[PDB]
PDB file of all heavy atoms in Angstrom:
ATOM      1  N   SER E 497      28.487 -21.504   3.355  1.00  0.00           N
ATOM      2  CA  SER E 497      29.036 -21.533   4.706  1.00  0.00           C
ATOM      3  C   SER E 497      29.057 -22.933   5.301  1.00  0.00           C
ATOM      4  O   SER E 497      29.545 -23.099   6.421  1.00  0.00           O
ATOM      5  CB  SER E 497      28.235 -20.607   5.615  1.00  0.00           C
ATOM      6  OG  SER E 497      26.853 -20.910   5.565  1.00  0.00           O
ATOM      7  N   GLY E 507      27.550 -14.712 -10.705  1.00  0.00           N
ATOM      8  CA  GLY E 507      27.124 -13.338 -10.621  1.00  0.00           C
ATOM      9  C   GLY E 507      27.260 -12.579 -11.927  1.00  0.00           C
ATOM     10  O   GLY E 507      26.748 -13.019 -12.962  1.00  0.00           O
ATOM     11  N   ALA E 520      37.504  -0.463 -24.641  1.00  0.00           N
ATOM     12  CA  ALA E 520      38.725  -0.596 -25.431  1.00  0.00           C
ATOM     13  C   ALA E 520      38.435  -0.482 -26.927  1.00  0.00           C
ATOM     14  O   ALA E 520      39.173   0.190 -27.659  1.00  0.00           O
ATOM     15  CB  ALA E 520      39.422  -1.918 -25.124  1.00  0.00           C
ATOM     16  N   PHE E 707      24.776 -48.931  17.942  1.00  0.00           N
ATOM     17  CA  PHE E 707      23.340 -48.715  17.867  1.00  0.00           C
ATOM     18  C   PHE E 707      22.670 -49.228  19.137  1.00  0.00           C
ATOM     19  O   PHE E 707      22.827 -50.395  19.500  1.00  0.00           O
ATOM     20  CB  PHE E 707      22.776 -49.438  16.635  1.00  0.00           C
ATOM     21  CG  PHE E 707      21.314 -49.767  16.740  1.00  0.00           C
ATOM     22  CD1 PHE E 707      20.358 -48.790  16.580  1.00  0.00           C
ATOM     23  CD2 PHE E 707      20.903 -51.071  16.962  1.00  0.00           C
ATOM     24  CE1 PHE E 707      19.017 -49.101  16.653  1.00  0.00           C
ATOM     25  CE2 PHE E 707      19.560 -51.381  17.040  1.00  0.00           C
ATOM     26  CZ  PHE E 707      18.614 -50.388  16.893  1.00  0.00           C
ATOM     27  N   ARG E 767      30.923 -39.901 -13.941  1.00  0.00           N
ATOM     28  CA  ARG E 767      31.501 -39.920 -12.608  1.00  0.00           C
ATOM     29  C   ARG E 767      31.911 -38.537 -12.124  1.00  0.00           C
ATOM     30  O   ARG E 767      32.044 -38.333 -10.918  1.00  0.00           O
ATOM     31  CB  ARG E 767      32.715 -40.849 -12.569  1.00  0.00           C
ATOM     32  CG  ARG E 767      33.159 -41.236 -11.175  1.00  0.00           C
ATOM     33  CD  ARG E 767      34.308 -42.235 -11.227  1.00  0.00           C
ATOM     34  NE  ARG E 767      35.035 -42.350  -9.965  1.00  0.00           N
ATOM     35  CZ  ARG E 767      35.700 -41.368  -9.371  1.00  0.00           C
ATOM     36  NH1 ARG E 767      35.783 -40.159  -9.910  1.00  0.00           N
ATOM     37  NH2 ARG E 767      36.302 -41.603  -8.209  1.00  0.00           N
ATOM     38  N   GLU E 768      32.165 -37.608 -13.038  1.00  0.00           N
ATOM     39  CA  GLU E 768      32.354 -36.205 -12.656  1.00  0.00           C
ATOM     40  C   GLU E 768      31.025 -35.506 -12.403  1.00  0.00           C
ATOM     41  O   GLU E 768      30.944 -34.614 -11.554  1.00  0.00           O
ATOM     42  CB  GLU E 768      33.147 -35.471 -13.733  1.00  0.00           C
ATOM     43  CG  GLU E 768      32.425 -35.358 -15.062  1.00  0.00           C
ATOM     44  CD  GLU E 768      32.871 -34.163 -15.879  1.00  0.00           C
ATOM     45  OE1 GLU E 768      34.099 -33.984 -16.056  1.00  0.00           O
ATOM     46  OE2 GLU E 768      31.997 -33.397 -16.345  1.00  0.00           O
ATOM     47  N   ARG E 817      32.236 -32.227  17.726  1.00  0.00           N
ATOM     48  CA  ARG E 817      32.460 -30.787  17.782  1.00  0.00           C
ATOM     49  C   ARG E 817      31.191 -30.019  17.422  1.00  0.00           C
ATOM     50  O   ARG E 817      30.960 -28.923  17.949  1.00  0.00           O
ATOM     51  CB  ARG E 817      33.628 -30.383  16.892  1.00  0.00           C
ATOM     52  CG  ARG E 817      33.338 -30.406  15.405  1.00  0.00           C
ATOM     53  CD  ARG E 817      34.623 -30.250  14.592  1.00  0.00           C
ATOM     54  NE  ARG E 817      34.394 -29.581  13.318  1.00  0.00           N
ATOM     55  CZ  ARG E 817      34.105 -28.297  13.185  1.00  0.00           C
ATOM     56  NH1 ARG E 817      33.999 -27.490  14.227  1.00  0.00           N
ATOM     57  NH2 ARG E 817      33.926 -27.797  11.960  1.00  0.00           N
TER      58      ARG E 817
END
Side-chain angles (χ1 to χ4, degrees):
Chain E
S497 54
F707 156 76
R767 196 176 163 298
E768 65 154 50
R817 74 191 210 71

